[PDB]
Design a protein around this ligand. Sequence first.
Ligand SMILES: [Ca+2]
Ligand SMILES: [Ca+2]
Ligand SMILES: [Ca+2]
Ligand SMILES: [Zn+2]
Length: 259
Amino acid sequence: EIVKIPVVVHVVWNEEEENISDAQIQSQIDILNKDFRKLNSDVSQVPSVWSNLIADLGIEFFLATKDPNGNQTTGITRTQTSVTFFTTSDEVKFASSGGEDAWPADRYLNIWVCHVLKSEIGQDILGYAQFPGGPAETDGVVIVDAAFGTTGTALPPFDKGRTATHEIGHWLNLYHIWGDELRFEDPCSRSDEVDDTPNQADPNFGCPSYPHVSCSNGPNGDMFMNYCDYVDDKCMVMFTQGQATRVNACLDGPRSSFL
Ligand SMILES: [Ca+2]
Ligand SMILES: [Ca+2]
Ligand SMILES: [Ca+2]
Ligand SMILES: [Zn+2]
C-alpha cells in the first residue's frame, strides 16, 4: 500500500550554479523517501506526548524514468531561463514565462526548482505548492534550489530537504498547522483541519524550544516539529496520523491517479 510517486524535477536556472546537480536533486528525493515513510531518524525529536501520533504516510517518490511520451528520462529537466526570480504566480511552471511546463500532473509530481521565489507581496520564499484539485498545468511544488536537497547549493537551515517535504505536504492536501490566519483574524481561530495537530497561533520559525505554547495549547504547545509548520528543516520531523488521513483522502480522491 506504498504509493510510489514518480517525480519530475524541473530545474530552471539562470546562473549555472542554479542548475543544480543530480546529486543535489537525488538527495532531496532521498529525504522525501524518509520523511514520507517516517524513516527520518530525527523523528526521535518528536515530543513523547506526540510520539504515538507520528505517521508513516506510506508514500515514496522516485525520479521518473519515463517521460510523458514514454521516452527514457532521468526525471530531471533543466531549463535555462533569463528570468531572475519566480513567484507564486507560477511563471516557473510555463515555458512561455521562462520556466518549464508541467508534466502530466496525474502521472508525475512536478517539482520545479528555481533560484529565487517571491510571494505576491515580494517576500522571499523557499517554496510553494499547489493543493490538489488545481489545474494540471501548475500542479506540483516549487522549491528554491538553496532549500532543495542536502548538498550542492542547499544551505542551512534549509538543507535537510524539508522545504520539499513541507510543500509536498501541501501538494497532498495538508495545510499549515497554524491555520493561516490573516493578520486581522484571531490567531487561534483557524484550523488546519487536523485534530491531532494542536491549535496553534502562528507559524513557528527557526527552532522553538519545546513546549512552545500558543492558543492556550499548553502544556504540550505547538506541534512546531510538524512538517506543516515553518520551522527550520532540522526542527520538523513528522507528520501526524491525522495528517495522514488527509493525505490518504488526497491520494484516494483528487490524486488517485497515483494509486
Ligand atoms: Ca496560478
Ligand atoms: Ca489542528
Ligand atoms: Ca492559528
Ligand atoms: Zn507551506
